[PDB]
Design a protein around this ligand. Structure first.
Ligand SMILES: Nc1ncnc2c1ncn2[C@@H]1O[C@H](COP(=O)(O)OP(=O)(O)O)[C@@H](O)[C@H]1O
Ligand code: BEF
Ligand SMILES: [Mg+2]
Ligand SMILES: [Mg+2]
Ligand SMILES: [Zn+2]
Ligand SMILES: [Zn+2]
Ligand SMILES: [Zn+2]
Lengths: 291, 402, 137, 47
């Protein structure tokens, strides 16, 4: 019931499937999918992978879980969730994050562990998938593949400095000091036309305070691909990764990395006349995991 | 002469239980429950007949009731169940276990079969004598239970097996039953819900608002029970749930008899139960209870037929319940509800000698029933009288024959 | 709306539900159930949906069921009559207090005269929902 | 059909019970007696 618009994802069903996969994953399944059953271990394969990982996550206190998508392919009940994850990055990733938080708090509660749930529910957990299929290069990504998980490998040529990214504006009313904080949604900030107070109403009382806004890290990394396959007469191509938050300042120049993330496209403004955008979209990649 | 569609599961369980073919012969499936199914069987070896022979009611032949729990139930929960049934053996009102064993995951409990009649059969046509005896037995059983110091969260007529021919009843399910833990190592600070963990800025008041982005946690309190038969304590997730939720459920069952309504409180969620309680009692009373338990509550805009109504008491409520049945004529000519209807007609002001004696006695009985109903139906736990206090009522003069 | 909140606001509100006036148009399906009593010993908060106590077919079916169970109800009353016990009752047949009430039998006579011409367990869930969840919903 | 529920033993939600009981995790859980040791302790105390 209740699939989201423009997608094939149902929140309840996807959360159910992800919880099922978390509860009942054993590495022997991946061994079966790898046709490596002759290497099946009695110890590690028996033990529940992600439950244990969530445990050491709880004791250590980390907030990020790295998920192998081929493990999702291994589990029969979540084979469809794999394709749902490729085709719909952001929605399914948020679903996974909520499910991780739910599983953490549930596991604490069920065992009645002395560890307090104050930190757990306040924390924000992130899921970082990887090993999501093949590479296919960048010459072979058609525009229909916008906002999908892609796997890229190459050499990190150049790394820009840290670029602050606005998260909350801090407009201040000059007249009645009505300092409202505006969160950014879908990269848009909406100015109060007049003073949001009813008693005080002065449109010119607003003057954004740059310094008291809350920002977030953003680093652009120039990656030159080294695809496993190269078409005839194709010189190497450079793509612009865009990392966020903790991944900033992680990848140094000269590192040979394999990166997975969301293949995005953004209009580029023709600066000849302001607020006029070119019809050709620039393509870049948001980064979720770096190996 | 039995449905074979049940016989296939019977034989499936039979060969699923390799340690029972010689021990017992399965007779039939008698009971069905949310957490388990109950099977009737014959006792091949007589030692179990000798064991707890006094416990076995001697009415009819002696059979044994088999408790086939569902596999999905927690092993820790099943351990709680068996331990609790173990530590209240030999009570004659609580069902004592006779044997217990498991085959890998599946676990089976052996209980003395109690020939009973379905509650649906007789709630409509039970004389106030029947209510009196039934409630007396049930309160004696709960007196023993609370003396042992536990809480049987799910109290309902389905979980209480009463026999009319014997005129006695016993409790059976203890599935969600909880042992009362150590509450602590005046009444305003008895339960404002500040117990155990979290025990011992101004200018902002969320009196008429819900935060847009919610960044806070919910109460974590046991919610075990039934659809309905749930006490205001647990309904509002009020901390330190006491034994008296059980007597609240008892009073709910009692009122169900007085009105001939089996699904008395159809609560699809907590909100349904809370609003139904608001209807029966009043917004102000429920708000007062919440304030007593350190809990804010508000409701406005809703329309109620009785706006803070029924303050006269439960008499008016059961009164108009029976009034509409009277106008329609649902009840039979011989229905014993008509005497109650006349009782409320007389009290609300709205050969013959034996007749006058009989009506005098039923006046007294209905009177005492209605003043024990309000005795149990009060939101205050500390003020709510204990099971022994309920048994000490003037209505319960039949225990005085001891 | 209905709003129940922690007095010290240390914990999240338990129940917080508000309804638009427009969806309250029909009195039959209020989100908060009303004391629509109904009949035939049903739930006081539910009624005779797809049911009419005056429906002559329903009256006949109920009358037949009642006359079927006359003897059992009489046995119950005989078993339980003013002695507060069963075995103590062992040693007048019945006592009928008259009433002006209508019953199944009288209503039936009136009508005949008129026509004479799943599991129960669920995984524990977290309380706080992420803002992205709110956007998705 | 209607046998859809939550298997707290396996901490898992199943659409069908007959398949959950034969699931690998549930079968392994059943085959492990270490989870039932406390139960057996009171089982033996009966005799
Ligand atoms: N000893 C018994 N004698 C007769 N019926 C019983 C007995 N034990 C259980 N039952 C029947 O089986 C039903 C379910 O048993 P119960 O122990 O309440 O299981 P659950 O924990 O699943 O609710 C009861 O409501 C009752 O009808
Ligand atoms: F359904 Be039983 F009353 F746990
Ligand atoms: Mg039960
Ligand atoms: Mg139970
Ligand atoms: Zn202003
Ligand atoms: Zn309280
Ligand atoms: Zn299982």
């Amino acid at each position: 019931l209740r699939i989201i618009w423009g997608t094939n994802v149902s929140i309840q069903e996807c959360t159910t499937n992800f919880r099922n996969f978390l509860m009942s994953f054993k590495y022997k399944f991946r061994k079966i999918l790898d046709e490596r059953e002759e290497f099946i271990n009695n110890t590690t394969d028996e033990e529940l992978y992600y439950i244990k990982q969530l445990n050491e996550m709880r004791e250590l206190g980390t907030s990020n879980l790295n998920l192998d998508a081929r493990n999702l392919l291994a589990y029969k009940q979540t084979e469809d969730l794999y394709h749902q994850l490729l085709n719909y990055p952001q929605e399914v990733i948020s679903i996974m994050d909520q499910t991780i938080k739910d599983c953490m708090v549930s596991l604490i509660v069920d065992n009645n562990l002395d560890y307090d749930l104050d930190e757990i529910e306040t924390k924000f957990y992130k899921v970082r998938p990887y090993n999501v299929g093949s590479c296919k290069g960048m010459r072979e990504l058609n525009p229909n593949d916008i906002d999908k998980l892609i796997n890229l490998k190459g050499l990190v040529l150049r790394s820009t400095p840290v670029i602050p990214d606005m998260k909350v504006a801090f407009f201040k009313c000059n007249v009645c000091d009505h300092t409202m904080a505006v969160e950014i949604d879908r990269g848009v900030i909406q100015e109060p036309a007049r003073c949001e107070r009813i008693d005080c109403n002065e449109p010119n009382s607003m003057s954004l305070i740059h310094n008291r806004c809350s920002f977030a890290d953003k680093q652009v990394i120039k990656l030159q691909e080294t695809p496993d396959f190269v078409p005839d007469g194709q010189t190497p191509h450079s793509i612009s990764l865009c990392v966020y938050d903790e991944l900033v300042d992680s990848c140094r120049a000269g590192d040979r990395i394999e990166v997975t993330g969301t293949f995005r496209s953004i209009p580029i403004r023709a600066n000849s006349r302001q607020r006029v955008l070119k019809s050709l979209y620039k393509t870049y990649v948001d980064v979720v995991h770096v190996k | 002469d039995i449905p074979p569609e049940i016989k296939e599961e019977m034989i499936q369980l039979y060969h699923d239980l390799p340690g029972i073919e010689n021990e017992y012969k399965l007779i039939d499936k008698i009971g069905e429950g949310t957490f388990s199914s109950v099977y009737k069987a014959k006792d091949i070896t007589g030692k179990i007949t000798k064991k707890f022979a006094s416990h076995f009611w001697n009415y009819g032949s002696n059979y044994v009731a088999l408790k086939k729990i569902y596999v999905t139930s927690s092993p820790q929960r099943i351990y709680n169940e068996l331990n609790l049934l173990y530590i209240m053996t030999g009570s004659s009102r609580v069902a004592p276990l006779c044997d217990a064993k498991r085959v890998r995951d599946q676990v089976i409990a052996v209980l003395p079969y109690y020939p009973h009649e379905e509650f649906r059969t007789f709630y409509r046509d039970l004389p106030i004598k029947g209510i009196k005896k039934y409630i007396w037995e049930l309160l004696r059983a709960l007196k023993f239970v609370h003396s042992k110091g536990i809480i049987h969260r799910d109290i309902k007529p389905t979980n209480f097996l009463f026999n009319l021919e014997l005129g006695r009843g016993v409790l059976v399910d203890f599935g969600l039953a909880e042992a009362q833990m150590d509450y602590k190592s005046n009444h305003e600070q008895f339960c404002p819900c500040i117990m155990r963990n979290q025990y011992s800025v101004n200018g902002v008041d969320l009196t008429k608002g819900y935060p847009k982005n919610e960044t806070r946690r919910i109460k974590r309190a046991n919610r075990a029970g039934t659809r309905g038969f749930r006490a205001p304590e647990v309904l509002m997730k009020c901390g330190a749930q006491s034994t008296k939720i059980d007597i609240w459920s008892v009073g709910v069952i009692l009122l169900s008899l007085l009105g001939r309504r089996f699904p008395m409180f159809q609560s699809l969620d907590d909100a349904d139960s809370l609003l139904e309680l608001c209807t029966i009692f009043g917004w102000k009373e429920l708000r007062k209870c919440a304030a007593l338990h350190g809990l804010g509550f508000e409701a406005s805009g809703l329309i109620w037929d009785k706006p803070n109504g029924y303050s006269n008491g439960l008499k008016e409520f059961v009164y108009d319940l029976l009034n509409k049945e009277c106008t329609i004529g649902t009840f039979p000519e011989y229905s014993v509800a008509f005497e109650t209807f006349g009782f409320l007609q007389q009290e609300l002001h709205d050969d013959a000698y034996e007749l006058k004696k009989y009506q005098e006695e039923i006046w007294s009985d209905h009177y005492w029933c209605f003043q024990v109903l309000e005795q149990c139906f009060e939101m205050d736990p500390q003020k709510r009288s204990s099971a022994e206090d309920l048994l000490k009522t003037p209505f319960f003069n039949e225990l005085n024959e001891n | 709306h209905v709003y129940l909140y922690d007095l010290w606001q240390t914990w999240a509100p338990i129940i917080t539900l508000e309804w638009k006036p427009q969806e309250l148009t029909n009195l039959d399906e209020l989100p908060y159930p009303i004391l629509k009593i109904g009949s035939f010993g049903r739930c006081p908060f539910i009624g005779d949906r797809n049911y009419d106590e005056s429906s002559y077919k329903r009256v006949v079916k109920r009358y037949s069921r009642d006359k079927a169970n006359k003897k059992y109800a009489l046995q119950l009353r005989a078993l339980f009559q003013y002695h507060a016990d069963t075995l103590l009752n062992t040693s007048k047949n019945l006592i009928f207090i008259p009433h002006t009430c209508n019953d199944s039998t009288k209503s039936f006579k009136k009508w005949m005269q008129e026509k004479a011409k799943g599991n129960g367990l669920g995984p524990t869930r977290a309380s706080v929902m992420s803002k992205n969840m709110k956007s998705l919903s | 059909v209607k046998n859809s529920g939550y298997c707290e033993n396996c901490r898992v939600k199943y659409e069908s019970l007959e398949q959950h009981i034969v699931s690998e995790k549930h079968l392994s859980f059943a085959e492990n007696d270490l989870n039932f040791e406390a139960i057996d302790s009171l089982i033996e105390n009966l005799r």
